[PDB]
């Protein structure tokens, strides 16, 4: 099964937080610009068709077991000119309120704790050419999942990260049977100093620095029918920990872990690449991929199929995804569902993700 997974701090940053991208196999770096294009590619916020947008996304966890354990997302975007846009997103994972109770006269006042984990980011995107755009984002991450007891300190752990994204969208190009469109995107994510959960520099965790590279094509038929096919590749920019042994039995493992944990995040970004005696094929096992197809009718109905494949050596997240989207007047509703194909139980199995966006303001034409 999973041999040597990459250990990163705040892994909740890697979870898809909107139903549209979830229904497309957890990919958004090269899909069409939308209100959720902050976790995936902020650079396409400059390609938005509506001036302003707001969005609320709900991803429940352990639906059969309990309520209120969920990852929510609130996104807002405002493109001021036809070339630039500002965006701000907030992701919040929570277990809900938990009451701390001893029997102790059960009418007694009780303390409610809400262990949570949130990220708040703001991005600026600017169109360089008519077909290309770039974006820079700044994110603050806070983790408060611990509950204060005796001999347990529940101080929150915080960190900062930066995001560099690029998005290319071509104009409509006529072909023999259809007039499609081309899209490409890259996104370097979560570049920042290590997060210390125990507030000690010796015990710090890498931020989940990530690289997404994707490309997509739009088959446009009849001016009312669209088929967007997108492919995304993802690589974690965190060094892989040592495994069984990389030449005193436990001494070698201890020394290897000591040298691995004493690696800077900046240097770790480059150490993620290579670090193997083999070639590109041996390094291909650290690349996750996803393929998505989205059929769109009258820009008002959307039907999404997706496939996400991690290498079973790390993570073991392999699944198919179903998605649907509707647009009434200015309100868009997305629903997504997951069919797992992995041996390890997916925490988002048998779960319906919900998304709801409001679009308002001026309308921009698409080049």
């Amino acid at each position: 099964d999973i041999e040597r997974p990459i250990t990163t701090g705040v892994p909740f940053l890697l979870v898809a937080a909107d139903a549209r991208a979830a229904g497309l196999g957890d990919q958004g770096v090269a899909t069409s610009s939308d209100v959720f294009s902050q976790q995936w590619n902020p650079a396409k916020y400059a390609f938005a068709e509506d001036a302003q947008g707001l969005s609320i996304s709900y991803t429940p966890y352990l639906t059969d077991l309990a309520n209120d354990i969920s990852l929510g997302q609130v996104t807002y975007y405002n493109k001021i000119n036809d070339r630039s846009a500002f965006a701000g997103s907030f992701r919040y994972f929570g277990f809900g309120g938990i009451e701390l109770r001893q029997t102790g006269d059960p009418n007694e006042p009780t303390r409610e704790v809400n262990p949570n984990e949130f990220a708040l980011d703001g991005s600026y995107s600017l169109k360089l050419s008519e077909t290309f755009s770039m974006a820079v984002a700044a994110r603050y991450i806070r983790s408060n999942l611990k509950v204060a007891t005796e001999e347990i300190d529940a101080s929150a752990a915080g960190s900062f990260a930066v995001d560099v994204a690029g998005f290319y969208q071509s104009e409509e190009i006529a072909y023999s049977d259809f007039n499609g469109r081309w899209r490409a995107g890259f996104n370097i994510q979560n570049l920042g100093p290590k997060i210390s959960y125990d507030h000690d520099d010796l015990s710090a965790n890498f931020l989940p620095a990530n690289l997404r590279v994707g490309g997509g094509f739009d088959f446009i038929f009849d001016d009312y029918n669209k088929l967007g096919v997108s492919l995304e590749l993802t690589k974690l920019l965190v060094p892989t920990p040592p495994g069984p042994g990389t030449p005193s039995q436990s001494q070698a493992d201890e020394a290897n872990y000591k040298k691995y944990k004493d690696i800077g995040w900046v240097s770790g970004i480059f150490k993620s690449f290579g670090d193997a005696p083999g070639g590109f094929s041996e390094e291909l096992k650290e690349i996750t991929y996803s393929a998505a197809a989205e059929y769109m009718y009258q820009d008002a109905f959307a039907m999404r199929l997706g496939y996400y494949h991690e290498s079973p050596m790390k993570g073991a997240k392999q699944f198919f995804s179903l998605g649907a989207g509707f647009k009434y007047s200015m309100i868009k509703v997305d629903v997504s569902y997951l069919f797992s194909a992995s041996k390890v139980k997916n925490p988002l199995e048998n779960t319906l993700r919900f998304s709801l966006t409001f679009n308002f303001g001026d309308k921009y034409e698409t080049y």
Binding site: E171, E172, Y175, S176, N179, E365, Y367
Partner: peptide
């Protein structure tokens, strides 16, 4: 009382020209 590809390309060219002229 007063060759679909070529048509699609002509429509795209007309749309581009109209969108360029309208804003300026």
């Amino acid at each position: 009382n007063r060759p679909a590809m070529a048509d699609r390309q002509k429509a795209l060219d007309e749309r581009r020209a109209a969108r360029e002229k309208l804003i300026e």
